[PDB]
Amino acid sequence: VKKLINSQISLLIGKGLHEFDSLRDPEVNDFRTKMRQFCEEAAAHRQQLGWVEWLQYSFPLQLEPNRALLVNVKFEGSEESFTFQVSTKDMPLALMACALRKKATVFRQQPEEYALQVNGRHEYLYGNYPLCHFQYICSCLHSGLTPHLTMVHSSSILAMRDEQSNLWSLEQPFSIELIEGRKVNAMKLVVQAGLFHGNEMLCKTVSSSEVNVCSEPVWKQRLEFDISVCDLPRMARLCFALYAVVDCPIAWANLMLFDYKDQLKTGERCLYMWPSVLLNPAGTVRGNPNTESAAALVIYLPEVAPVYFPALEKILELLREILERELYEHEKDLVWKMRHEVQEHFPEALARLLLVTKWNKHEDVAQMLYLLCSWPELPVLSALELLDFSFPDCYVGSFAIKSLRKLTDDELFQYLLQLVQVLKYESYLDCELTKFLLGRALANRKIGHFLFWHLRSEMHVPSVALRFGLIMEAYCRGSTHHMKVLMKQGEALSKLKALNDFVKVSSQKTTKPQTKEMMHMCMRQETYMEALSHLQSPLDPSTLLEEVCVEQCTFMDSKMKPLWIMYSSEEAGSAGNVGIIFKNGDDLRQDMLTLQMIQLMDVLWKQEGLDLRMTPYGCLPTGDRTGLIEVVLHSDTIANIQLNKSNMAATAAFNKDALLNWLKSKNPGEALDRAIEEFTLSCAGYCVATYVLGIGDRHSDNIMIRESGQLFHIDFGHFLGNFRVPFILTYDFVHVIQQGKTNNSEKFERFRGYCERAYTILRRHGLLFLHLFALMRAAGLPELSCSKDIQYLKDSLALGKTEEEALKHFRVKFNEALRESW
């Protein structure tokens, strides 16, 4: 069984476990043993959960950020059902009460023994919440559908649980010996080396003398640094760049001066370098795994005596307000001087005080750490700032996690992408963040699902494959059952790749209808029917992809030839008619980030009572330039509608009326009014979202509209002004908002109000977007690489301004967009 499980993990994670063994690396070995123990202990806990707690683990509630309604309810075993009129304000318990009373009459004769499953989904309705607080009920109310629910007894829930079981003394100047290298170039070679603590240099950079490009180079020289050995902070990073000159970058490499057990490194090291794009302090501190091909630098660290970093107890032994809302040297001195008062009276200003301490002085670090150990916990917002690479110290990192422990699962989910990216800044394998993420993941299966996919989707990236593979292994140790569920998803993804490759080849030699039929024959093979059917959606575990609907599957006969894959489920009814788009060829990371930021905007708006009728469709990278996008049914591109085809319900005398005609055709009579409203609200949301994020090149073929009237965007390729992008008002959109009238200032200005409201709400959470984007710099997205990218967001949110000035500014941009509008 252990052999089987080991082979299943290897397959699932995309790395053979033997590859970890082969490294013969103590840090790896220790990570694996400790984290396996941690995760297996979490699994033990989980298997004795009460039935309500089990639901909370496996089916966490989907909640929104008087009035009558019809609900259909059945019991688990029978096809018979009852349709009830209840209120939007009624609790699930009241509904379960009517259900059980109805069963007792028909069956000839305790609500608390049950939970309500959404038919054909892994989603449950339970808890003390009015029906309209549940995302599912909320959803039905807007679309018009009747909720379909299933009474599931506690014994059935426990059955699911059960089936799913498993020093201060060293004053000499720091120095190294640069021995030799082995590289490839055209000129002379130089080695630059700097000592870093996060972004900050701990002293000046020091260089080699110029040696000819032939080699196989040899230096054999001591490089001495302007910093005493006792002063080196715990997280000291030593960074190298090898380059050529008559500037031609060649390679770089970083390492920690202390190992994972706090011991100062000695003596010789061989540094397998990473190829270059000079110094890259934020780069990984682990060597290039391609030892066959990588240029290599051998260095020597001298035997200073074995010395370890001092223990905490030994460390513990050893105009203010006007600025405190970049600073001058004298301002820095004041902050440091008043550090006790910072702690006592401005605990939320911790980050500012950290950035003024001299991390290149051990006495000063000791004094900072003493305060930190008594520092009150900070809000979540503040803790996210502390995760930035600017705060490399391990005690600071540990403090950050401690303040982040109060994250709700929903908040954690919202920030998961960024917390995963921050792993790329970690100096060691065993760290507080990994342990935090693993514990949260093991306590909430939705968190576990997305953590898995965020890690799995980067396994083709050498710099993270080891770290991410190890985390995924540990996760599997803590849920054997979820491993098998994830393997089923991976198998479907493997088949989709093979199917897409086939389509790419076939469409080059034949017509689309011919390739489409061939696609269908391929899918109808037993191996494909089996692999593609009956899985949890990678885009949403709550969504069940039962039988694949081959007849309705197709592909886009352009660009990367993405696949359109439809599903149906008898048990889910209408809500089981769902699709996924599989794309191979494009890197989906920036799309996912853009969509997640838009979904965050939607949450913040809803928290202030503004529902802009957004369409946060799923987007998930799964592999190398591979991922999935959630199908939005009953939608079309604006461009297709504007084709203004004849013999259609939307056929228009003037092209400007095509879109309104289409919306009329989908929403006859009194329904037109609501559709125009959904269009106006969503238009405002996306107009504000794309403006703030700096997303240009919006055109008719990358905007879609739903039959409800809701607009949404696709094919984000560019953001943060990498194409200062203007606010955008399209005339055809204004025309719909104005109900087809040439002048309708009443409607148009309501729309302006929505835009301004949306914008002012985002400004109030501006620091959240800035902290999240800062963390995202870890991802290495080329459009999010430097300060100039972050500065775009600062300028778009106008955070240096009063709300009055910002709104004035926004108004000028909005007014400029309206004029531009024909």
Ligand SMILES: COc1ccccc1-n1c(CSc2ncnc3[nH]cnc23)nc2cccc(Cl)c2c1=O
């Ligand atoms: C209705 O879908 C379309 C309408 C007009 C033009 C293109 C599409 N469309 C689109 C438009 S993008 C889209 N379409 C539907 N739901 C979505 N969710 C996120 N993006 C979308 N995408 C495809 C992806 C794979 C295979 C196909 Cl066959 C398509 C596809 O037809």
